[PDB]
Design a protein around this ligand. Structure first.
Ligand code: ZN
Ligand code: ZN
Ligand code: ZN
Ligand code: ZN
Ligand code: ZN
Ligand code: ZN
Ligand code: ZN
Length: 313
């Protein structure tokens, strides 16, 4: 036949998906590949707080519902993203009296998780809670609720949907270091205390030629703690413009990343943060960098695609 990345991954008990956003759905060529090549989908924005609860106590899931429906139409699983995060938070949240924030956070989590109960395989419950040195990011939740907010978020999520996998998500935690160590200690602490948590999501926003050599050992140590691991927002940015050499290095990196996951039985899957450079978020956030995805702006498969398919075997 000629298997797709999704089919190759599923053949080995894993999923290979892509994130997507509502503004992209009109792109026929884009949605065609999206629906056939991948086995999993992650809504890029519309499940975030700024969209789901734009005003206190008033919820809105219509936009996110469209992505979920699309995924279901193609027989693709869906990862919820994300419940608690310091970015893309409506302004009213900062005005909530400190003593009421915990209740508000739980409520937000309860409504959204309950609404999508039974339709998602995972939920990125808390996103980017740590600084590069391992200390806690001083978000409104950390400052007004305290260290326990993460644990409380996971408890609230579990209470609203007992079957969905609860994930802690963050970037720059692919290699063994200060940041991943902090996440490691938190997960270890959670397991010992009985705090529900089913997996760690490594966003994996990597830089070409700079993939952490300890990636595999890092994925395994988390797996050994009793949690699944998933590469949730994979992309490997390079300094523009691209060249044959840069594309080749990128391909080697994608291959290495994929095989590292296939080596650890509890690494359940990989999701690229969208699949074509045409819509990559990279250029707008990392000046001078881009071309971080397997498909270029004209939907041509890059050498990176070859490496991924080869790794998936
Ligand atoms: Zn086919
Ligand atoms: Zn996108
Ligand atoms: Zn609406
Ligand atoms: Zn629907
Ligand atoms: Zn260490
Ligand atoms: Zn091209
Ligand atoms: Zn090829």
């Amino acid at each position: 036949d000629t298997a797709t990345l999704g089919e190759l991954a599923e053949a080995k008990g894993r999923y290979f998906g892509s994130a997507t956003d509502n503004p992209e759905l009109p792109d026929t060529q884009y949605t065609q590949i999206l629906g056939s090549e991948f086995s999993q989908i992650t809504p890029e924005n519309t499940m975030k707080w700024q969209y789901t609860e734009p005003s206190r106590g008033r919820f809105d899931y219509t936009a996110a519902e469209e992505i979920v429906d699309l995924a279901e139409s193609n027989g693709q699983s869906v990862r919820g993203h994300t419940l608690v995060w310091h970015n893309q938070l409506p302004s009213w949240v900062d005005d909530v009296p400190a003593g009421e924030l915990l209740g508000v956070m739980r409520d937000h989590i309860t409504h959204e998780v309950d609404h999508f109960k039974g339709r998602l395989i995972h939920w990125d419950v808390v996103n980017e809670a740590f600084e590069e040195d391992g200390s806690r990011r001083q978000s409104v939740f950390q400052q007004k609720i305290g260290d326990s907010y993460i644990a409380e978020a996971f408890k609230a999520a579990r209470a609203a949907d007992p079957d969905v996998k609860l994930y802690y998500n963050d970037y720059n935690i692919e290699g063994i270091g200060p940041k991943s160590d902090a996440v490691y200690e938190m997960v270890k602490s959670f397991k010992a205390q009985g705090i529900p948590i089913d997996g760690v999501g490594m966003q994996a926003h990597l830089i070409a030629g700079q993939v952490p050599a300890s990636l595999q050992e890092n994925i395994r140590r988390f797996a050994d703690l009793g949690v699944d691991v998933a590469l949730t927002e994979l992309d490997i940015r390079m300094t523009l413009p691209r060249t044959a050499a840069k594309d080749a290095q990128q391909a080697t990196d994608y291959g290495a990343v994929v095989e590292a996951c296939l080596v650890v039985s509890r690494c359940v899957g990989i999701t690229v943060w969208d699949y074509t450079d045409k819509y990559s978020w990279v250029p707008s956030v990392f000046p001078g960098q881009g071309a971080a995805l397997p498909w270029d702006e004209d939907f041509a498969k890059k050498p990176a695609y070859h490496a991924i398919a080869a790794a998936l075997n």
